Amino acid sequence: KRIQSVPLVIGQFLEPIDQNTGIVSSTTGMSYVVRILSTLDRELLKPSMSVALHRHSNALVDILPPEKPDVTYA
Amino acid sequence: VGVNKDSYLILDTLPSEFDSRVKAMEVDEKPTETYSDVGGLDKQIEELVEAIVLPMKRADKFKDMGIRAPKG
Amino acid sequence: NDKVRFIKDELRLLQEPGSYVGEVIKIVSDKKVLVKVQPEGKYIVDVAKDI
Amino acid sequence: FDSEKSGDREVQRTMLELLNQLDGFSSDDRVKVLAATNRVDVLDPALLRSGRLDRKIEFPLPSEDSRAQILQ
Amino acid sequence: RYDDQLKQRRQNIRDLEKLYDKTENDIKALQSIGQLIGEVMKELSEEKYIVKASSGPRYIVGVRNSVDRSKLKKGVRVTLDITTLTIMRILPRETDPLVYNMTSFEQGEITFDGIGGLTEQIRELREVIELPLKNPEIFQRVGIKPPKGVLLYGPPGTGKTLLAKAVAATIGANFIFSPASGIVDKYIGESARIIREMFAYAKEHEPCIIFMDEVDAIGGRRFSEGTSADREIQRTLMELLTQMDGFDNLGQTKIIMATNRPDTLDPALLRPGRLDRKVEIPLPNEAGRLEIFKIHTAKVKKTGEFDFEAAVKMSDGFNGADIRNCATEAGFFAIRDDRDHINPDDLMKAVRKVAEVKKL
Numbered sequence: 012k013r014i015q016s017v018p019l020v021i022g023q024f025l026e027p028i029d030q031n032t033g034i035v036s037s038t039t040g041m042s043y044v045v046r047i048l049s050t051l052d053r054e055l056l057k058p059s060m061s062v063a064l065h066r067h068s069n070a071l072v073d074i075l076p077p078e079k080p081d082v083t084y085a
Numbered sequence: 086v087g088v089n090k091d092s093y094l095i096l097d098t099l100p101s102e103f104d105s106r107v108k109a110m111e112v113d114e115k116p117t118e119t120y121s122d123v124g125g126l127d128k129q130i131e132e133l134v135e136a137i138v139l140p141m142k143r144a145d146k147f148k149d150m151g152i153r154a155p156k157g
Numbered sequence: 158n159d160k161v162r163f164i165k166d167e168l169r170l171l172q173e174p175g176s177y178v179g180e181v182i183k184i185v186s187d188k189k190v191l192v193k194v195q196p197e198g199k200y201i202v203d204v205a206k207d208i
Numbered sequence: 209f210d211s212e213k214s215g216d217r218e219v220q221r222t223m224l225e226l227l228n229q230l231d232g233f234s235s236d237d238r239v240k241v242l243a244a245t246n247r248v249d250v251l252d253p254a255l256l257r258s259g260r261l262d263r264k265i266e267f268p269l270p271s272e273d274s275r276a277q278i279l280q
Numbered sequence: 281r282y283d284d285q286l287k288q289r290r291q292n293i294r295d296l297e298k299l300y301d302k303t304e305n306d307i308k309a310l311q312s313i314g315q316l317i318g319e320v321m322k323e324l325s326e327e328k329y330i331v332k333a334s335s336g337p338r339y340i341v342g343v344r345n346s347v348d349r350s351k352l353k354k355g356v357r358v359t360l361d362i363t364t365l366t367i368m369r370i371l372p373r374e375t376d377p378l379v380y381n382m383t384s385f386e387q388g389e390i391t392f393d394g395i396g397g398l399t400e401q402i403r404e405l406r407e408v409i410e411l412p413l414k415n416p417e418i419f420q421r422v423g424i425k426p427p428k429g430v431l432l433y434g435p436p437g438t439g440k441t442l443l444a445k446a447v448a449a450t451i452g453a454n455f456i457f458s459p460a461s462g463i464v465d466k467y468i469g470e471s472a473r474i475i476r477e478m479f480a481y482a483k484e485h486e487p488c489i490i491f492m493d494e495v496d497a498i499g500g501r502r503f504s505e506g507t508s509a510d511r512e513i514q515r516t517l518m519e520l521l522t523q524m525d526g527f528d529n530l531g532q533t534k535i536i537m538a539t540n541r542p543d544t545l546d547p548a549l550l551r552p553g554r555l556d557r558k559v560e561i562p563l564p565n566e567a568g569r570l571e572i573f574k575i576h577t578a579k580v581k582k583t584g585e586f587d588f589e590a591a592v593k594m595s596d597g598f599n600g601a602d603i604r605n606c607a608t609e610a611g612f613f614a615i616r617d618d619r620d621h622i623n624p625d626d627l628m629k630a631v632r633k634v635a636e637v638k639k640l
């Protein structure tokens with residue numbers, strides 16, 4: 012749970028290859044293979060979601076998720 | 086200004102050193118073509134030089150009036 | 158015991174480095190191939206025991 | 209040429225410097241710029257705005273009297 | 281004798297205490313190595329924020345003890361270290377006085393505006409804009425909602441930048457103005473930060489008027505292809521709209537915009553209720569041009585005459601801003617004849633070239 016703390020680095024999931032390994036094309040520019048950790052969902056990742064990585068390893072850590080009409084029939 | 090490589094801090098000013106691909110465009114007087122070598126266009130050259138050498142030399146006729154002068 | 162093995166194995170190697178991705182152009186004679194890293198240039202390489 | 213691409217921006221951004229260079233100095237310091245072209249139905253009127261490049265020359269074709277000078 | 285040899289020393293020493301403290305100052309700074317600059321997307325907890333550097337990436341970080349977590353919100357500019365990436369200090373007021381500048385004397389309540397050309401406009405904007413600012417507690421109880429914004433369209437070459445500068449200065453309103461060029465010329469992908477600062481600064485100096493020309497530049501692609509490369513040309517419209525909706529339209533901030541091609545405008549917004557009142561504008565007429573030529577030409581040593589009347593009747597098909605040129609179209613002939621007090625002969629043949637200048 013320690014490394015899951017700061018200072019992380021962002022990325023962008025692309026696709027899996029195994030029960031415990033996926034890939035990323037981060038914002039830094041390049042593409043890296045990387046292993047997800049357990050204690051973590053899987054159901055919520057396959058698209059180009061948003062993610063968070065561990066800097067030096069370039070590992071993976073945890074997930075992160077996120078006009079006004081005013082009228083009425085009277 | 087100058088600045089360190091690792092701890093970016095101002096260290097020493099320095100001039101504006103121009104590029105070789107600009108100094109090159111400075112020119113000799115290799116041109117040798119007098120206004121007698123050109124035909125017609127007594128006007129256009131007459132109109133031109135009333136924007137160039139007189140402001141280079143005789144701008145007082147402008148500056149005494151101080152009119153909104155031309156640039157190019 | 159085999160519980161604490163895993164997490165102590167897993168945590169050992171999230172400290173592990175990254176791993177790049179690339180594509181093959183051809184194969185040099187043996188124990189030698191070439192790759193282009195899909196954003197960037199070429200890198201002849203070696204291979205491992207298994208492949 | 210509206211875009212966000214590299215090649216479309218770096219071009220025009222030069223022009224954006226040229227303007228600020230024209231409108232940076234005054235008619236006291238004694239530069240005098242000019243220019244040339246084969247076309248006027250193609251270029252941006254911001255250069256033609258009052259102050260930057262105002263005086264113009266409509267170089268015509270030559271009248272028949274001028275034809276006599278040029279050949280001689 | 282042996283007193284002066286010492287009296288130069290008390291001067292000597294103090295002339296070093298100055299010297300020392302400097303050379304001891306600088307080393308006190310060199311250890312304080314540099315930092316890195318970013319900007320925020322959103323917020324997650326006092327222990328974890330998000331940032332966006334000035335060299336790409338979108339890091340996640342923490343934060344130091346001292347700085348108030350209150351002031352840290354979206355839009356802010358930020359600074360932090362290089363290794364740990366922990367935010368410490370803030371710098372607001374992204375100054376750019378080449379962009380905008382105030383006119384406090386425009387809060388004079390008796391200011392001069394006497395150039396020519398146009399009267400019913402300056403007469404009506406006084407109606408459009410005065411009352412919602414001075415005592416607007418009536419627009420509510422009567423029932424209506426006043427106009428959040430305005431638009432001033434017309435042909436080019438008309439000198440309206442000075443107009444809106446003027447009439448907000450006689451009324452006694454704090455006027456500020458920034459083109460929509462440098463915000464997208466100097467600032468490619470760091471623009472909309474300036475927008476919101478341009479309002480907050482404008483807020484706490486309430487009341488105040490806005491003016492901003494070349495407004496047709498925000499469009500860019502206008503989502504011409506929906507690619508993620510024109511985010512600047514897209515969002516720069518977004519932050520404009522979200523902010524002007526935030527006024528509540530109470531009567532201590534109003535807005536003006538302008539261009540030549542309203543048919544080229546971006547009615548994705550600014551049409552329906554934001555720039556509600558659209559106002560065209562005219563060109564001069566048989567006497568306005570003497571109302572105009574009485575301005576520029578009056579300010580130079582001519583001979584003194586009234587060929588203006590017989591002149592402008594020869595003039596026709598004539599835009600507005602070509603008149604700073606028309607005088608100086610003649611000034612370039614007075615000096616040729618080596619003169620001081622010009623004659624109308626330069627003016628009678630002044631336009632004779634200028635009419636062909638309109639060709640191209």
Ligand SMILES: Nc1ncnc2c1ncn2[C@@H]1O[C@H](COP(=O)(O)OP(=O)(O)O)[C@@H](O)[C@H]1O
Pocket residue numbers: 395396397398435436437438439440441442493572575600601602603604
């Ligand atoms: N009604 C007017 N009175 C005085 N000068 C004018 C008038 N209309 C245009 N001008 C001249 O035109 C120039 C301003 O035009 P400009 O502000 O560029 O128009 P726009 O803002 O529509 O581009 C000034 O040099 C000014 O002297």
